[PDB]
RNA sequence: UCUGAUCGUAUUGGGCAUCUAACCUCGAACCCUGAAUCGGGUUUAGGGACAGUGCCUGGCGGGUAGUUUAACUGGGGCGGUUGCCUCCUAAAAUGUAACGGAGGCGCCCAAAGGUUCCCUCAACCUGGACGGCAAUCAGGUGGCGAGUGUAAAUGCACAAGGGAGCUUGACUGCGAGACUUACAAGUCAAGCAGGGACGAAAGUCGGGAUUAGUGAUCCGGCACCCCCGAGUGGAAGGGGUG
RNA sequence: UUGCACUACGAGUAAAGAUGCUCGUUACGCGCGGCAGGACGAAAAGACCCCGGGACCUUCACUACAACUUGGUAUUGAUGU
RNA sequence: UACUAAAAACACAGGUCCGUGCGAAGUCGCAAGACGAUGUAUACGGACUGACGCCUGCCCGGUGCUGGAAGGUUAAGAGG
RNA sequence: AUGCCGUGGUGUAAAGCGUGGCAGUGAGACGGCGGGGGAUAAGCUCCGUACGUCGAAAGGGAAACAGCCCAGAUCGCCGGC
RNA sequence: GGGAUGAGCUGUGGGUAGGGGUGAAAGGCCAAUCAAACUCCGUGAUAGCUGGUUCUCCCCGAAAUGCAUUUAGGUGCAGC
RNA sequence: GCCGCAGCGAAAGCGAGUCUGAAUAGGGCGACCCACACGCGCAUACGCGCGUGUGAAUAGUGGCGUGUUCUGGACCCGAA
RNA sequence: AAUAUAUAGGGUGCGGGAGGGAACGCGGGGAAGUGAAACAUCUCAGUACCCGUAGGAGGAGAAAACAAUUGUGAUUCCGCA
């Protein structure tokens, strides 16, 4: 009910984070601007 | 013969309290009070930490006092 | 005959150029969630196997 | 260790591979150099062994720790970017 | 060119029936044979591509074999218990035992995180359409008796409690110096840089008032980096990082 | 069988039931025949009990294996449908 | 139960069920071979009951045994 | 009140600390003082105590009497306190 | 004291062998031995268990606690 | 042939450094003498940097003792 | 011979085998206790034992070999690695 659901970067799509939500509170796949590594800055990413 | 079956259990020893005392001499980093809560605030030169674990932030010497009500712990560079 | 050295401790300990004997640290494998950035930097590296242990331990690597 | 798991399986293994096509070099610095032949000269790989510096049958590798002061003219294996310089800065020449 | 039907060609396979020559017969006769209910050979009567056996494969299998079946404990059995968190025992630092006294945990929250700003509670009293002990309202009084996602302790009214706006730091590269500690572990951390959020600024932010919500190694899986690549170029496989 | 030996009793004491220790009381030295209260008498490294090991037995404990059995394939051919 | 148990234990004649169509089933052997038996279902092997007399009720859900094969699932081989 | 941590003096040979060689121990016992379990019983049982002795401590006292009181035995003496 | 013309007793010769025999069945018996005989070999089996371990003096001198443990009469590490 | 003679890194590799990293950030591991004469811009006299040393204070390895230890019956005796 | 070709079989005449041996060789079969502080994979260990078969030794042996750009040139045994 709460999954380990990963983050992909939009751009170089490599899996920078991993965290948890509720997949029935958010049963939609989550969208937040976090820092990639790769890119150098801060980026858009969703699940997998 | 019954049982203590609702009993027997406890947690570990957490080691808290103070770790330097009044008028000793520390590091910068130095560890001064270990706790739950604010049992001592942070004063001049003391920090809090993540859980309320009130550091040094610069060398000099321990001093405990009293800022309206509350028990203080500061630093004297 | 000769003396046999220990296969599970010669891949978990070595030598530096002092005579130093270090080793790499546990809790890192798996299960990498729930573990903050704050510890996994800590668990990084190598340390110096603790003046309890290396007696055993140079006997092992002997 | 009585029965618990014991240090030679609680801790990890350390990471990574042996290389084994590794090509390891006898290392001989070019401070050496200045104390065994303080008149200068050739020096190759056969006057290293009679020397003492360096291990027979085996590639050599010139490193650049001390200071070369004499003017050596010296043939070996695979030089150092620092000891390249202190070789034509003391007025000599070094080739492979 | 599609679904359905039919037909031809070629290929492969299953049923069904017949055949005899493989093979089978403790059915019969004859010979080796002088003495032979053995054996082998010959002919005949039947059976027959079945059976039996080899290799491969599934089932069943206490018939046999090797073994495992925990500890604690006011003897053992039976019952209860085992890790983590909080309190008392605990003798005013820390630590401290018993099958001593009480409880909780194996989660939850995309806001219940971050920051910026603003607010003060419960209870009591008086008045008020429905309306009551108590809904919403108005005025008094009230320094915390309320509240805190969740047990308890320590905290918090300066709020860490109530409301709102924008946000993703629930960061990456690190870390002087400490706490705790047999060891493995656990915990705290100023500050530095990158790229960010909020704020006029000062600044604050590496999840949550704090302490539980977890599992060493080995062995693998996936994603990226492109380190090694058993003559060479690749590949297989391995390695690193998450 | 046997560590010894010129090997009493009572109240105590002590590893908590004393010939041997304390304080007393009693008892000439040495044999023979009887009795069976004690010497925690002798004999058997307690069968009970528990802990460690083993063995054999049981079964819907675990892993195997014989036996029995399934299909493919070889031995294995010919012809119709 | 030689050597602490002679019994109410075992055996028995009679009973019933089940297996077996014949180098039978069953057993001993890796096999050949043997026994069963120079026997042939009124026979032979297993199990349970135990002279005799009167009797032996109900349950086929569990678990085995026997028979079946519509449906589900499932090996190697084939297919690629 | 004690205890604990720091610091400045003063005292005190065989204290403390770091790193190596070799250990043994990990069944404790009673007494004092503080507490739990038990009936505020136990020669009970479980903890605390820079508390003590026995363990591993002879000698003197407690009649005898591991643990209580005094005192720590290098050896000799027909000395003394 | 039981049987004592019988499912009797006995002599001689023979057959069955160790996870095997044989058993009117007691785990009986298989050379005074049987819940798997005896003998030799593997072999000097192994035992966290009990016992034993041999001349002298000098100097120092413990512990019976913590933590972990298929662990609690064992051991590792710390303490001394 | 072995050990000493340079280390760091998973490794490619580079080397008194090197790994990580965007870093000329910090950290890990590894080298690194001021006890000292003159002097060099010198600093209150102090000592940072380098020649000649004032001639700084280190090193391994092969034998043989001894203690522990590994593999062997491994101090000795003892099962079912 | 049955039975025709013949064959099985039978007659005759020369040769050879058989069994024993202490260890060593080659080929085949193959444990358990033990160790893993339990135990099944694993170990013990291809050991013990067994079967066949030699010889004064035996087995191996004359590249369908290594190696890695240079090369070595049948096998066996020893020391390193
Ligand atoms: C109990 O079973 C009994 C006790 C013995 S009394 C010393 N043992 C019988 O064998
Ligand atoms: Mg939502
Ligand atoms: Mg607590
Ligand atoms: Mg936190
Ligand atoms: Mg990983
Ligand atoms: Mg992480
Ligand atoms: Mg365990
Ligand atoms: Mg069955
Ligand atoms: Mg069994
Ligand atoms: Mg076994
Ligand atoms: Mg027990
Ligand atoms: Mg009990
Ligand atoms: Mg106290
Ligand atoms: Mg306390
Ligand atoms: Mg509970
Ligand atoms: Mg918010
Ligand atoms: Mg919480
Ligand atoms: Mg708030
Ligand atoms: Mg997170
Ligand atoms: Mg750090
Ligand atoms: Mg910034
Ligand atoms: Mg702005
Ligand atoms: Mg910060
Ligand atoms: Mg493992
Ligand atoms: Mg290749
Ligand atoms: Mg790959
Ligand atoms: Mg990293
Ligand atoms: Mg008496
Ligand atoms: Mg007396
Ligand atoms: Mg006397
Ligand atoms: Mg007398
Ligand atoms: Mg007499
Ligand atoms: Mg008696
Ligand atoms: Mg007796
Ligand atoms: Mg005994
Ligand atoms: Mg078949
Ligand atoms: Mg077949
Ligand atoms: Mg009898
Ligand atoms: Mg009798
Ligand atoms: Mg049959
Ligand atoms: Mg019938
Ligand atoms: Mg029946
Ligand atoms: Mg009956
Ligand atoms: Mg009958
Ligand atoms: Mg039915
Ligand atoms: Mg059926
Ligand atoms: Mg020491
Ligand atoms: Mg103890
Ligand atoms: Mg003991
Ligand atoms: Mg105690
Ligand atoms: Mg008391
Ligand atoms: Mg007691
Ligand atoms: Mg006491
Ligand atoms: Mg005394
Ligand atoms: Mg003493
Ligand atoms: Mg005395
Ligand atoms: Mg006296
Ligand atoms: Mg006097
Ligand atoms: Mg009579
Ligand atoms: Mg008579
Ligand atoms: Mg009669
Ligand atoms: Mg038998
Ligand atoms: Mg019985
Ligand atoms: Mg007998
Ligand atoms: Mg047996
Ligand atoms: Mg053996
Ligand atoms: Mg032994
Ligand atoms: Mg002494
Ligand atoms: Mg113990
Ligand atoms: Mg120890
Ligand atoms: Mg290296
Ligand atoms: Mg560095
Ligand atoms: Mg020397
Ligand atoms: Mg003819
Ligand atoms: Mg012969
Ligand atoms: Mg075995
Ligand atoms: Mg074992
Ligand atoms: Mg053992
Ligand atoms: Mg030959
Ligand atoms: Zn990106």
Request: hydrophobic share 30%.
């Given at each position: 009910?709460?999954?380990?659901?990963?983050?992909?970067?939009?751009?170089?799509?490599?899996?920078?984070?991993?965290?948890?939500?509720?997949?029935?509170?958010?049963?939609?796949?989550?969208?937040?601007?976090?820092?990639?590594?790769?890119?150098?800055?801060?980026?858009?990413?969703?699940?997998? | 013969?019954?049982?203590?079956?609702?009993?027997?259990?406890?947690?570990a020893?957490?080691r808290?309290?103070?770790?330097?005392?009044?008028?000793?001499?520390?590091?910068?980093?130095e560890?001064?009070?270990?706790?739950?809560?604010?049992?001592?605030?942070?004063?001049?030169?003391?920090?809090?930490?993540?859980?309320?674990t009130?550091?040094?932030?610069?060398?000099?010497?321990?001093?405990?006092?009293?800022?309206?009500?509350?028990?203080t712990?500061?630093?004297?560079? | 005959?000769?003396?046999?050295?220990?296969?599970?401790?010669?891949?978990?300990?070595?030598?530096?150029?002092?005579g130093?004997?270090?080793?790499?640290?546990?809790?890192?494998?798996?299960?990498?969630?729930?573990?903050?950035?704050?510890?996994?930097?800590?668990?990084?590296?190598?340390?110096?196997?603790?003046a309890?242990?290396?007696?055993?331990?140079?006997?092992?690597?002997? | 260790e009585?029965?618990?798991?014991?240090?030679?399986?609680?801790?990890?293994?350390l990471?990574?591979?042996?290389?084994?096509?590794?090509?390891?070099?006898?290392?001989?610095?070019?401070?050496?150099?200045?104390?065994?032949?303080?008149?200068?000269?050739?020096?190759?790989?056969?006057?290293?062994?009679?020397?003492?510096?360096?291990?027979?049958?085996?590639?050599?590798?010139?490193?650049?720790?001390?200071?070369?002061?004499?003017?050596?003219?010296?043939?070996?294996h695979?030089?150092?970017?620092?000891?390249?310089?202190?070789?034509?800065?003391?007025?000599?020449?070094?080739?492979?």
């Amino acid at each position: 009910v709460r999954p380990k659901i990963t983050l992909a970067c939009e751009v170089c799509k490599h899996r920078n984070y991993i965290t948890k939500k509720n997949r029935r509170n958010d049963p939609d796949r989550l969208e937040l601007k976090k820092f990639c590594p790769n890119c150098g800055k801060h980026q858009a990413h969703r699940e997998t | 013969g019954a049982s203590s079956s609702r009993n027997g259990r406890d947690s570990a020893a957490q080691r808290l309290g103070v770790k330097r005392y009044g008028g000793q001499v520390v590091k910068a980093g130095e560890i001064l009070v270990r706790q739950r809560g604010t049992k001592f605030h942070p004063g001049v030169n003391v920090g809090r930490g993540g859980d309320d674990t009130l550091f040094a932030k610069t060398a000099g010497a321990v001093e405990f006092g009293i800022k309206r009500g509350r028990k203080t712990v500061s630093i004297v560079g | 005959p000769k003396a046999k050295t220990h296969s599970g401790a010669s891949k978990r300990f070595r030598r530096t150029g002092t005579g130093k004997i270090v080793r790499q640290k546990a809790n890192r494998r798996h299960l990498l969630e729930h573990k903050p950035s704050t510890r996994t930097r800590r668990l990084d590296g190598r340390t110096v196997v603790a003046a309890n242990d290396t007696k055993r331990v140079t006997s092992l690597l002997n | 260790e009585g029965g618990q798991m014991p240090i030679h399986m609680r801790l990890p293994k350390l990471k990574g591979f042996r290389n084994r096509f590794r090509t390891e070099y006898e290392i001989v610095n070019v401070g050496d150099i200045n104390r065994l032949f303080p008149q200068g000269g050739a020096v190759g790989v056969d006057d290293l062994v009679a020397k003492g510096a360096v291990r027979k049958n085996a590639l050599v590798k010139v490193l650049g720790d001390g200071k070369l002061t004499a003017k050596v003219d010296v043939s070996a294996h695979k030089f150092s970017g620092s000891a390249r310089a202190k070789i034509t800065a003391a007025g000599g020449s070094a080739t492979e």
